[PDB]
C-alpha cells in the first residue's frame, strides 16, 4: 503493498516497509500488507497487488500498525492517530 | 506449506521454514504458511496442504516474509524483491 503519502507516514510514525493492516470501512475487508512511501503531498493511498481484490478505489480505510513492546513501554504508550480528509490531507493528529 | 525453489529462497533471503504470507493475485486469497525448500532450478512453487483450497496451480502469487526489527535496523532496512518469469526464473532482484 500500500502506497502511502509519506507525509502521512511521517505523521503516523509508520516506517516505509512496515507491516500494516488495512481495515475496510466501506466493505469490511481486513488484510495485512506493508507500507510503501508515496509522493509527498499527493495524498496517495494506493492498493497494489492482490489487495486490489479486496480494497477498491474510493474505499474508506484504516491503516494500523502494531509493535512489540516491553511491559514498561506498553504501559506508557500513547498511540498516534492521524485524521485526514477526503483527499487524505491531515486534519489532526491525536496521541494517546 | 509452500514448496519453493531454493534458488528463489536464496535470492529472497527467506529461510526454509520461515513463515510467509501468500497473496493471490489471481483470486485474491490471502494466507499464512511457511516455506519449504524445493528442487533448485525447478522453479517450483508448490501449494501443499489446506492451502490448496485457496491457491491453485497457475495462480499468480506474492510470497512475503516479515521480520521483527529494532528501531535502528528498521530504519535502515532495504527489503528484497525477487522478480520472476512465468517459470519462476529470476529476472531481477531489487533492494530497498
Amino acid at each position: 503493498x500500500v502506497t502511502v503519502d509519506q507525509d502521512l507516514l511521517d505523521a503516523a510514525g509508520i516506517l516505509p516497509f512496515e507491516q500494516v493492516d488495512i481495515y475496510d470501512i466501506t466493505n469490511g475487508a481486513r488484510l495485512t500488507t506493508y507500507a510503501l512511501p508515496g509522493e509527498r503531498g499527493s495524498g496517495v493511498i494506493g492498493i497494489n497487488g492482490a489487495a486490489a481484490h479486496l480494497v477498491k478505489p474510493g474505499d474508506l480505510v484504516i491503516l494500523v500498525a502494531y509493535g512489540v513492546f516491553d511491559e514498561e513501554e506498553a504501559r506508557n504508550l500513547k498511540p498516534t492517530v492521524v485524521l485526514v480528509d477526503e483527499r487524505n490531507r491531515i486534519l489532526e493528529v491525536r496521541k494517546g | 506449506x509452500v514448496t519453493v525453489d531454493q534458488d528463489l529462497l536464496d535470492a529472497a533471503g527467506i529461510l526454509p521454514f520461515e513463515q510467509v504470507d501468500i497473496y493471490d493475485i489471481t483470486n485474491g486469497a490471502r494466507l499464512t504458511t511457511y516455506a519449504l525448500p524445493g528442487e533448485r532450478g525447478s522453479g517450483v512453487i508448490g501449494i501443499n496442504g489446506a492451502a490448496a483450497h485457496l491457491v491453485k496451480p497457475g495462480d499468480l502469487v506474492i510470497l512475503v516474509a516479515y521480520g521483527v526489527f529494532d528501531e535502528e535496523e528498521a530504519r535502515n532496512l532495504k527489503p528484497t524483491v525477487v522478480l520472476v518469469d512465468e517459470r519462476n526464473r529470476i529476472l531481477e532482484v531489487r533492494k530497498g
Binding site: X1, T3, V4, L8, A12, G13, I14, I25, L36, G43, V44, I45, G46, I47, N48, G49, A50, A51, A52, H53, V55, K56, P57, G58, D59, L60, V61, I62, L63, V64, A65, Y66, G67, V68, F69, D70, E71, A74, L77, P79, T80, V81, V82, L83, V84, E86, R87, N88 | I25, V81, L83, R94
Partner: peptide, 24 residues
Amino acid sequence: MKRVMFHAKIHRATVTQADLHYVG
C-alpha cells in the same frame, strides 16, 4: 512478556488508486 500493541494508524483514509498488477 512482550506485548503487541497498536502504535499508530491512519484513520479513515480514502483509497485513491489501485494496481493489481503492480510490479515492485
